[PDB]
Amino acid sequence: MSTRLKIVTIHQEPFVYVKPTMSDGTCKEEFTVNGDPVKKVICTGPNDRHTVPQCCYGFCIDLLIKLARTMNFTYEVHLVADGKFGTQERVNNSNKKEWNGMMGELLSGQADMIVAPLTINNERAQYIEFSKPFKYQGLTILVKKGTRITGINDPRLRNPSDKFIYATVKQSSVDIYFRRQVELSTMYRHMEKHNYESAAEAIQAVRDNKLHAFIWDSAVLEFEASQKCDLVTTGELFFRSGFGIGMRKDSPWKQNVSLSILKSHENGFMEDLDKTWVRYQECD
């Protein structure tokens, strides 16, 4: 075993924050609102196409540090080069299909482990190994406060027109979800015209009334609505899914990664992380 893993992650608050280094190349010392030291790692990545050291922290970085300490491995973290989570796409109308995003980097060896809010699904599980879920959540819908839709069955979603724009993030698990089912083909035909490069851009477009509904992970959307009281979620969860650590099928770490996640759910470590990063007050 090399024992030094290439970790790939992705910007995705509150799971992964990405901030510039200080002038001297280190990460500013910070504490959370509840007084815990914020553990920061150097993560190289694009920032606009050169790669530059940046500072990463959040729920997923805390989990990475717990895993590395428990199993005694070392690591280097980078941000996924294309900025995507990962879907499988046909190559140049060939026979071959190829994964983009973090999935593609893990399968190619550019990464040895994905530590990110990476959705567990059949499509990805065919090719990589997932841990047991480190977070249980689902899909919901973000709108500007004052926008009235019932949820995923609303006629403005099920009978789409250019008068009500809705979308998700390109090359993500939610993209897969709507492309998977022929029943959803009309919805997908609309979203494919409007899907955004990243969650943060889609969320800003909702605030700016350029995107009318954003379909995405509830653990992210409920957090965003908790900070930005002009945004709300609607419809509860219309689908339930979990996040897992991603590894190639030959990883020597996969059994102990899952055991550590299970131990951490059962002893309140995951509760601490959820309270620190994920949970928040309702607006009023």
Binding site: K132, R240, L262
Partner: protein, 283 residues
């Protein structure tokens, strides 16, 4: 048969696994049930017993039927008779876990919780039902979840909460390990079982009941008057799920994982939840 015909163990626990008598005139299981064998004891102070043909149905039985069809195996289903889900006694496992560990069953299908201890000796499928340690109260009572300081430090509040669980299982063991004061405080409010706890809540003798999320959601969905409610799912503690237990290194695990994930992605799991678990109380 041979390697495609699998010994499978389960455990009666409605609505996940429901056990019925077989028709004595026909001795055939019909409707949505499948045959399941039970070793029924002769009396309470004996190891003697006799196998009885029963019929089994429920949420987990329909999962088993789908896996049987999709993964292409047949099975001989039996009900565990020594223990329940799985406990280690004197370094020996009983319950459903024991049947798998000691190679009497290829898989265990039931309301069997994925945890760290069991995962050292069996392999678990992906979770097929979400659960965890949750809280039920009468509508109007205000708490967040197990880690609420109204539970951790009840004497900071007036009057102090009365709250309990069903003792001697995984819930008490978890609270004992994680929250020593809470654990010793709640022993006075131990409930003999779920049904007793619901009555205690409804009649004002108990303020909160801490127990399995899936069980509590099911009971809340069916409550007369829809007055018993659970906490929000974001506040479930030690989130996990029910999963299928297989022997370490099982050749069936990959196929079973992919099949369960396909069922989830195609909505088939949602259909089963609506069929078996979702109740009239919608909030």
């Amino acid at each position: 048969s041979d390697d495609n015909h699998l010994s499978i163990v389960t455990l009666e626990e409605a609505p996940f696994v429901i056990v019925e008598d077989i028709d004595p005139l026909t001795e055939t299981c019909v409707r949505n049930t499948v045959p399941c064998r039970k070793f029924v004891k002769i009396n309470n102070s004996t190891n003697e017993g006799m196998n009885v043909k029963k019929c089994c149905k429920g949420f987990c039985i329909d999962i088993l039927k789908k896996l049987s069809r999709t993964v292409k195996f047949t099975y001989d289903l039996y009900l565990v008779t020594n223990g329940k889900h799985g406990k280690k006694v004197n370094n020996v496992w009983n319950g459903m876990i024991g049947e798998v560990v000691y190679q009497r069953a290829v898989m265990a299908v039931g309301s069997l919780t994925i945890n760290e201890e069991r995962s050292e000796v069996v392999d678990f499928s992906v979770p097929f039902v979400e659960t965890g340690i949750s809280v039920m109260v009468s509508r109007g009572t205000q708490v967040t979840g197990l880690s609420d300081k109204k539970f951790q430090r009840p004497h900071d509040y007036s009057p102090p909460f009365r709250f309990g669980t069903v003792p001697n299982g995984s819930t008490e063991r978890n609270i004992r390990n994680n929250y020593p004061y809470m654990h010793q405080y709640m022993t006075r409010f131990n409930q003999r079982g779920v049904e007793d706890a619901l009555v205690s809540l409804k009649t004002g003798k108990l303020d909160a009941f801490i127990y399995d999320a899936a069980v509590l959601n099911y009971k809340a969905g069916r409550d007369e008057g829809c007055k018993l409610v659970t906490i929000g799912s974001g506040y479930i503690f030690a989130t996990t799920g029910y999963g299928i237990a297989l022997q370490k290194g099982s050749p069936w695990k990959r196929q079973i994982d992919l099949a369960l994930l396909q069922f989830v992605g195609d909505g088939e799991m949602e259909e089963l939840e609506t069929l078996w678990l979702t109740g009239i109380c919608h909030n």
